[PDB]
UniProtKB/Swiss-Prot annotation, chain B:
Database matches in NCBIfam families: arch_pth2, PRK04322.1
Cellular component terms (Gene Ontology): cytosol
Protein name as it appears in the record: Peptidyl-tRNA hydrolase
UniProt cross-references to HAMAP family, sorted A to Z: Pept_tRNA_hydro_arch
Pfam entry (one): PTH2
Amino acid sequence: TLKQVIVVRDDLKLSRGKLAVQVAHAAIIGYLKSDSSLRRKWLDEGQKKVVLKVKSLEELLGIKHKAESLGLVTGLVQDAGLTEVPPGTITAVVIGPDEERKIDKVTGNLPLLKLE
Amino acid sequence: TLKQVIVVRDDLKLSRGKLAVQVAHAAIIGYLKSDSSLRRKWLDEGQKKVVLKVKSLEELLGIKHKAESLGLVTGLVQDAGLTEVPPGTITAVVIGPDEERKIDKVTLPLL
């Protein structure tokens, strides 16, 4: 089973609508950086995703590092459209799509991002 | 400037964390259905997006109808993995990316 994991920071003064935008950026970035075969199988399986959150940049990057150490494809989200944060600000990280069991070893215990 | 719009429904109550998932699904769907050249430029511009919410399914489909009348690419989001709701349930609609001047026209009360 394949899955794409998106992790966003909540420690930024971003509204629910702005966070949702960052989630959408992450989804696309992850798809674009993934293998053609992998992402095709992902789409056919329903492009499963889980969106989680962290409370700091260090925790966000810690997750990214761990995923990269395992060999997973990662992506960073830096939105120049955000005018209240300094340039280069990292709002989220994407992992996969890839094998769910492998990605879960990294983010299997993180809380869900609740925009509802 | 190019932009992609994603609209969700507040008359649809989803489980914890599911809303963010549907939004991500919409982004992908819109990207895939869009013109290769147009989306490429969109990405280079910073893949600008806006996420909105409407009253219910009727307003959501109304936006889809209006966008289609303007020649904008639209997509419906139906998540088979969302067993919490009946199959075929429309969770969102994605429009674009396309010229923000055109899509801004398709954008009734919001949120």
